[PDB]
Design a protein around this nucleic acid. Structure first.
Ligand SMILES: [Mg+2]
Ligand SMILES: [Mg+2]
Lengths: 235, 239
DNA sequence: TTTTT
DNA sequence: TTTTT
């Protein structure tokens, strides 16, 4: 099974899972965006298909009362940011078309984030993947607390459109790279959903995996054992 | 077991991190470190106290069948200004010591305003549900936290809530409670409520009625799916 | 290659 | 009945 290949190293969680052609997604009825998406890449799999034949549409195999709509994002000020990236899925027109499901979208800052630094992170994972045995990428939104002036910690985020789609404060990305058979490089990033200077290197957004777990309420690469991790966030 | 099937007869609100305790079912949210929902089932017979039971020798503690890193602890609540508010109320579970002890799992707790809410109007709503249930054949109650949007001083909508303790336990902005009362066999009265997690003044609990649909949308849950609307004879006091 | 009323 | 040192 493709899906069982994609999810070899663990399910981050089991809420409202859909297995699409080339990735697995978990959808959150409350925020109207994904809990997470998992992707599996090989050099083989990263190689006629056109993407502007694609239009974002709701995945209606989820109940309608829990759907986002293009009308939620329209004039929001945010892009429809695709967590499982179209560029990662080009072995078929279907596979790429499903990356355009709104279940796979989060409201993302456009210029200075989704169109730049977040895009740079995606391109980095793709390029590293092209010279690795297997690559596993888990992406998801976050809603992080901030201490404010009264000394109290608050989670605050905008919601948009009539369906109140959540605007994540941050996004995480965790990549597992099989370098030598049975052995892995692990890269864990948290980036703010905000304008980021192009000056900043992606490694500045490294965080320990445990931080991603706690913040997202997910078990990332549980089925995997830490002996087989040879490199962690560069080290 | 067969008990959990009686409890969940009219459907699962969701399937995330479900635990079946002896007399109620709970769904646990790893992000908020509190419940998504709890579902309870009462009857007049089950509201008779059993002998030897006692709620005085009960202490709040985590349910460690969830992974440690997603638990809340008593230290998260300690000196926060909020109560450990039981969603499935101790008072609903009368038939054994374990059944009531389990309502003291922290998975069943939300940070709640005490004076003016948990100890007052929220408790008034709980007692009201037990009272109605002594006169009904079957009663199902679904309870949970909400985190609701507020139009701020720009023109943008925001969800904002406090998190407490080192584990960042969410302080809900509101709580819903939906009660399905079987008034005659196969015929139900439905009552849906949303209250703010705040001091509530004289205010009748019926001021907090909202359509079921509004609770489903806010909570991202499917409440009482296996219930045919033909069978509903009353909705928040009407019809 | 990422997207926008 | 609810809870908190
Ligand atoms: Mg993107
Ligand atoms: Mg209480």
């Amino acid at each position: 099974s493709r899906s069982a290949e994609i999810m070899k190293h663990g399910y981050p969680g089991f809420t409202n899972v859909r297995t699409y052609e080339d990735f697995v997604l978990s959808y959150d009825y409350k925020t109207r965006t994904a809990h997470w998406v998992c992707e599996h890449l090989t050099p083989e799999r990263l190689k006629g298909v056109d993407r502007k034949l694609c239009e974002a549409k709701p995945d209606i195999t989820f109940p309608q009362k829990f759907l986002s709509q293009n009308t939620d994002y329209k004039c929001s000020g945010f892009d429809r940011g695709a967590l499982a990236a179209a560029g990662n899925h080009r072995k078929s027109q279907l596979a790429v078309d499903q990356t355009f499901y709104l279940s796979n979208m989060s409201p993302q800052v456009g210029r200075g984030f989704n169109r730049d630094k977040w895009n740079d992170l995606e391109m980095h994972c793709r390029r590293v993947a092209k010279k690795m045995i297997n690559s596993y990428i888990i992406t998801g939104p976050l809603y992080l607390p901030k201490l404010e002036g009264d000394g109290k910690k608050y989670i605050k985020y905008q919601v948009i459109g009539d369906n109140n789609v959540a605007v994540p404060t941050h996004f995480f990305k965790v990549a597992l790279f099989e370098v030598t058979p049975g052995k892995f490089e692990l890269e864990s990033y948290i980036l703010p959903n905000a304008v980021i200077e192009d000056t900043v290197e992606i490694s500045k957004f490294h965080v320990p995996l445990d931080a991603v777990e706690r913040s997202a309420g997910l078990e990332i690469f549980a089925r995997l054992d830490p002996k087989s991790i040879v490199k962690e966030n560069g080290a």
